[PDB]
């Protein structure tokens, strides 16, 4: 099998910034990887296209995936509103880790974050399911619009997304 590769084209107040592509570890977390892949192609009728990164904290991570409320309180999986913590085999070892945001054990929906640093304190609590394959420089450019409190100075959106491989 081959792990899926997904992309996001990021825009900053509608201006295109660039493409970030992600390898999803379907061989290790199939259900979590499948959820993010299907939400990136929009094939169930809902997904990430047009949604924003609502909380970016420089040196920590960029968070997005709330396509229903756009503020951290909504979004849902392709399995129903929430699904279980599949496993915690993988850790938040450094910049580029793609991991699920949540509100406690077994509350995975659509929200995710992209780590810009090693965040070992989230190991065992947030399921790591992918990594940035190309476009880490686009993630870095994105951090310049966040703040310590997480609010962005510009609206950072996923102008388009889908699967490459």
């Amino acid at each position: 099998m081959v792990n899926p590769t997904v992309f996001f084209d990021i825009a900053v107040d509608g201006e295109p910034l660039g493409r970030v592509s992600f390898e999803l570890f379907a061989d290790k977390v199939p259900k979590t990887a499948e959820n993010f892949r299907a939400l990136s192609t929009g094939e169930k009728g809902f997904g990430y296209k047009g949604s924003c990164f609502h909380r970016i904290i420089p040196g920590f991570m960029c968070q997005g995936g709330d396509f229903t409320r756009h503020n951290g309180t909504g979004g849902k999986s392709i399995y129903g509103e929430k699904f279980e913590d599949e496993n915690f085999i993988l850790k938040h070892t450094g910049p580029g880790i793609l991991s699920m945001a949540n509100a406690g054990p077994n509350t995975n929906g659509s929200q995710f974050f992209i780590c810009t640093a090693k965040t070992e304190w989230l190991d065992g609590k947030h399921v790591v399911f992918g990594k940035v394959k190309e476009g880490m420089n686009i993630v870095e450019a994105m951090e310049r619009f966040g703040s310590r409190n997480g609010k962005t100075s510009k609206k950072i959106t996923i102008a388009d997304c889908g699967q490459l491989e």
Binding site: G72, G75, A101, N102, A103, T119
Partner: peptide, 11 residues
Amino acid sequence: XLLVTAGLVLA
């Protein structure tokens, strides 16, 4: 603190 939650963002 530095968490990534959905709904109540904690310190």
